[PDB]
Design a protein around this ligand. Structure first.
Ligand SMILES: CC[C@H]1OC(=O)[C@H](C)[C@@H](OC(=O)NCCCOCCC#Cc2ccc3c(=O)c(C(=O)O)cn(C)c3c2)[C@H](C)[C@@H](O[C@@H]2O[C@H](C)C[C@H](N(C)C)[C@H]2O)[C@](C)(OC)C[C@@H](C)C(=O)[C@H](C)[C@H]2NC(=O)O[C@@]21C
Ligand SMILES: [Mg+2]
Lengths: 48, 120, 215, 114, 122
RNA sequence: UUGGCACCUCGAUGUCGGCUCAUCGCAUCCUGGGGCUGUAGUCGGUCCCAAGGGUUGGGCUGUUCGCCCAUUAAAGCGGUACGCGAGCUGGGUUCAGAACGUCGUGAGACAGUUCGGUCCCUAUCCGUCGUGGGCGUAGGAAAUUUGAGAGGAGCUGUCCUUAGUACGAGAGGACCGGGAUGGACAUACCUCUGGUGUACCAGUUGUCGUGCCAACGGCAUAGCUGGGUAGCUAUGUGUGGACGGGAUAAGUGCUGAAAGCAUCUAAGCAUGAAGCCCCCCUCAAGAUGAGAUUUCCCAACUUCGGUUAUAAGAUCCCUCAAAGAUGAUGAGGUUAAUAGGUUCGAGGUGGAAGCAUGGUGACAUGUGGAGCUGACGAAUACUAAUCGAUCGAAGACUUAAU
């Protein structure tokens, strides 16, 4: 139950290929033109 | 239904307390799951209020907490009285709804999707 | 010989002649339409494709499988039919009898046939070694620490490996299963329902492919 | 229709001539046993213990004492092996299922009429 | 559902007041039995006298288990106690004043002398 | 197996039984085919072909083993570090305590007994069971697919009939085939019988509180107790291993010579098993050989495509569950029943509250199968799926038909 050997830099960088953050679901707000998250209330204006 | 990451007694209590607070304030801020679960409880209480017969009053007394509101001109009346005298009239003609929900962005301390549940 | 696409509604019971509780699965087969007639020289094997249910027609900006897409509208309009929801085909049937564009009707089955119902099982999700595989689990007392896990996965130095097929934890359900030698107790032509003795695979609101026993 | 179809299919097999009763009633049940010779009738007498969901799937239960040995029989209300039913006397209970009679014998299992 | 190490009451005046079972005849690995099934058993309480005496090994056939039996019409017959009757290796009892009811399913198993010498067939 | 040798391992290769899980050989325990017999058939014995499947539950010992009690068609023999402890136990054995018998003057000792005696580890790699993303399949897509291969099953009893027939002084007593039911085991499902059901109904104890009686809430394992819907389930319900082909094994032959006879063999040609292949269930074109059918999409700048953005199609995002660890799958996004609510209903519980009557009271009766009712069925846009955004083709050469 211990690592029998090192994980080389190649293996490391390989495993984390799919480890990333997604760009937010952002759309432009119709009253102010600033971006907002879709289905959420704009925090700059306060609309829909 | 949902469990809200909590036991039964602690949830029963949280749901009824959150419903009472909503009735007091007419719009509150909370996380999505608890809004989604207080929606039904508050909607059903308003139904118990659209009849106003003593049976429904006594039965709705089960859920609401005993709180006092100071209205304008230092007028005082409790949550039951509000439900049955100021909210029954407003929704005498509407046959559902009674509440809306407006998603907001994630909070800072967690990634919880805060929302505002308001009486419509 | 016969085949119909249907969906499962539930189970009830029928008191048949000589007072016998016949457990039954009601199946709703409605507007089954032939959409093609596969042929040996055109496709290499003779069979017919049946479409079941009824989707709505194409609309611009559709966001769900409720409405047909342009590709499917075309396939069904070549059989003058409405877009359908479930499409399967049958090989046991003899193609000359059928015709492109016909309706397959519940009345294809008479009382007392022998049929095979092929559906998909209900999903149980990620399930342990003993519910998925029927394994006897270990002792619950006498100082045991082996309650539900699977036992040895192999031997020792000989086969210093786990062999393929070792019955280990995974996802149960979602498998095509064919129960064989069931029979139909009644066919109702107005509500469009074929009643089948016994029980069939799948969730309620599913899909079953009834055809004539191959045995 | 995708809902009434179950009842629309079982309606042709539902009886109207059966009476209306409730748990706690001692009722005689006529049954058509088909032996090797004929279909001789025979009578079963008991106290209804419970009854379950509607449709062809309603099943009630009766209980009796044969030779000091409790016996309970469960029937579907629409099985066609019942020739006739008689609610021989009414019963004042306060349950819907009467499981608590499996531990009593004699006057302890008493029922008031009406 | 009757398995080995299950104590049953005897329903005869053969001499055994109560017995327990060892096997359920009928198949390798057979584990349970219901009305109409025969087993092997050794009495544990005998009457003073009687033909069968305490500590003997005997065949017997189940009558009126409390798990009860489904009948082909959806009718179920259940009972309030397990019970059994000793047999003479010919489907024939030993006593002749059998007590307690008996199911009607013993008719099929050709336990007819058991069904004929019975207070109530059911 | 008991050994012999001392070749790897003492900077550690946990050793015996049992549990869980098996897997493979066949010198086969049962089942299938046969030659036989000092085989009349049932009986048995012997040998051959056969490994597809199957090959119990207990009492006694730490025991393997063995004996015994009941069964079964049978209760097979072995390999796998005397399979398997980073899967489990720790009874035996092998630490320190103690004690008896024996040996020793003694400290102590005995593979002589006896009671007691800490089983650690968050899985990197290969392996294995599931489940995603990328890319390739000479355009981009939606659906239906053949099957190269691969996996799973594969067991068998009793009764009746033929038939009390053959065969039998008798006693006993089928072969075949043809019916009917089981055991075990695998699957699918909740209609029935049951289990569970911690946001359903009801009764009840102590105590605190909404001033107060009545009503109700909090806590006491969900306080307890009786029920119980959906879901999930077996012990419950169906289903399955049914035929039937093709090639064979031991074996049985036919015609037939070397060797004018014979003779199963050499030519050839027959028959013959739960065995082989197909047949039956499931997965399967990453089957880089990347397959097939139907349909959908089809322009216009180039200054020469190493080209935008768009089709057809999806996704983002959001309401969800017949699906689910997550992601996938599937039902839906206003041109909308996807979920919540509202209305009606099923099922469950069992006679709500307030009244009036009767009782000293504890209570009872009518209103009124009333009241309540989580997932279950239907209708209804009342509330939320409002707005928007991203990705996504323009089809290579060569030769032959054209
Ligand atoms: C809790 C975490 C710690 O783990 C452990 O205690 C576990 C439990 C221990 O398992 C075992 O007991 N055996 C498995 C059980 C076998 O029973 C049969 C009946 C017996 C006995 C016996 C015999 C002699 C003596 C002895 O003579 C004496 C004295 O004092 O003279 C003291 N007694 C007690 C003896 C008792 C580890 C794993 C143990 O290793 C194992 O021992 C074996 C000797 C060899 C094993 N292999 C090489 C084949 C080996 O794998 C060690 C030695 O620990 C004592 C581990 C070492 C590394 C440690 O020290 C670690 C740091 C532990 N210390 C701690 O704090 O964390 C621990 C992890
Ligand atoms: Mg080392």
């Amino acid at each position: 139950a211990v690592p029998k050997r090192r994980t080389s830099k190649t293996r490391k960088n390989k495993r984390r290929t799919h480890f990333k953050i997604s760009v937010p679901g952002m759309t432009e707000c119709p009253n102010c033109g600033e971006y907002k998250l879709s289905h959420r209330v704009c925090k700059n204006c306060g609309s829909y | 239904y949902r469990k809200l990451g909590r036991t039964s007694d602690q949830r029963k209590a949280m749901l009824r307390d959150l419903a009472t607070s909503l009735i007091i304030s007419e719009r509150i801020e909370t996380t999505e799951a608890r809004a989604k679960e207080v929606r039904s409880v508050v909607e059903k209480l308003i139904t118990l209020g659209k009849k106003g017969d003593l049976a429904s009053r006594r039965n709705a007394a089960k859920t609401l907490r005993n709180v006092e509101i100071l209205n304008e001109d230092e007028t005082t009346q409790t949550a039951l009285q509000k439900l049955f005298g100021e909210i029954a009239e407003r929704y005498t003609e509407r046959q559902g709804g009674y509440t809306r929900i407006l998603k907001q962005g994630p909070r800072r301390g967690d990634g919880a999707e805060s929302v505002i549940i308001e009486l419509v | 010989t016969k085949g119909i696409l249907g969906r499962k509604i539930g189970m009830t019971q029928v008191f048949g002649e000589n007072g016998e509780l016949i457990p039954v699965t009601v199946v709703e087969a409605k507007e089954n339409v032939v959409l093609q007639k596969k042929t040996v020289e055109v496709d290499g094997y003779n069979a017919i494709q049946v479409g079941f249910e009824d989707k709505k027609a194409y609309k611009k900006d559709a966001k769900s499988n409720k409405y047909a897409n342009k590709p499917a509208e075309g396939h069904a309009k070549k059989a003058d039919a409405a877009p359908k929801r479930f499409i399967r085909e049958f090989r046991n049937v003899d193609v000359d009898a059928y015709e492109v564009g016909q309706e397959v009707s519940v009345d294809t089955f008479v009382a007392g046939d022998v049929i095979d119902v092929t559906g998909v099982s209900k999903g149980k999700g990620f399930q342990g070694a003993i519910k998925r595989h029927g394994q006897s689990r270990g002792p619950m007392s006498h100082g045991s620490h082996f309650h539900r896990a699977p036992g040895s996965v192999g031997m020792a130095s000989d086969a210093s490996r786990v062999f393929k097929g070792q019955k280990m934890p995974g996802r149960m359900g979602g498998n095509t299963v064919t129960v064989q030698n069931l029979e139909v107790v009644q066919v109702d032509t107005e509500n469009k329902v074929i009643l089948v003795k016994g029980n069939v695979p799948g969730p309620k609101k599913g899909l079953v492919e009834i055809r004539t026993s191959i045995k | 229709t995708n809902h009434k179809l179950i009842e629309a299919v079982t309606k042709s097999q539902l009886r109207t001539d059966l009476p209306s009763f409730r748990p706690g009633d001692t009722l005689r049940v006529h049954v058509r046993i088909i032996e090797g010779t004929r279909e001789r009738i025979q009578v079963f007498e008991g106290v209804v213990i419970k009854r379950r969901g509607g449709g062809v799937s309603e099943t009630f239960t009766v209980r009796k004492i044969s030779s000091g040995v409790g016996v309970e029989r469960t029937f579907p209300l629409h099985t066609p092996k019942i020739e006739k039913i008689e609610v021989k006397r009414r019963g004042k209970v306060r349950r819907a299922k009467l499981y608590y009679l499996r531990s009593l014998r004699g006057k302890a299992a008493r029922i008031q009429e009406i | 559902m009757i398995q080995q190490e299950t104590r049953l009451k005897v329903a005869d005046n053969s001499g055994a007041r109560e017995v327990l079972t060892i096997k359920v005849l009928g198949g390798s690995g057979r584990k349970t039995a219901n009305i109409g099934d025969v087993i092997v058993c050794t009495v544990k309480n005998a009457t003073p006298g009687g033909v069968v005496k305490k500590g003997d090994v005997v065949k017997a056939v189940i009558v009126r288990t409390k798990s009860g039996v489904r009948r082909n019409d959806g009718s179920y017959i259940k009972f309030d106690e397990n019970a059994c009757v000793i047999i003479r290796d010919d489907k024939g009892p030993r006593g002749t004043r059998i007590f307690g009811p008996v199911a009607r399913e013993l008719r099929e198993g050709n336990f007819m002398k058991i069904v004929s010498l019975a207070p109530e067939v059911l």
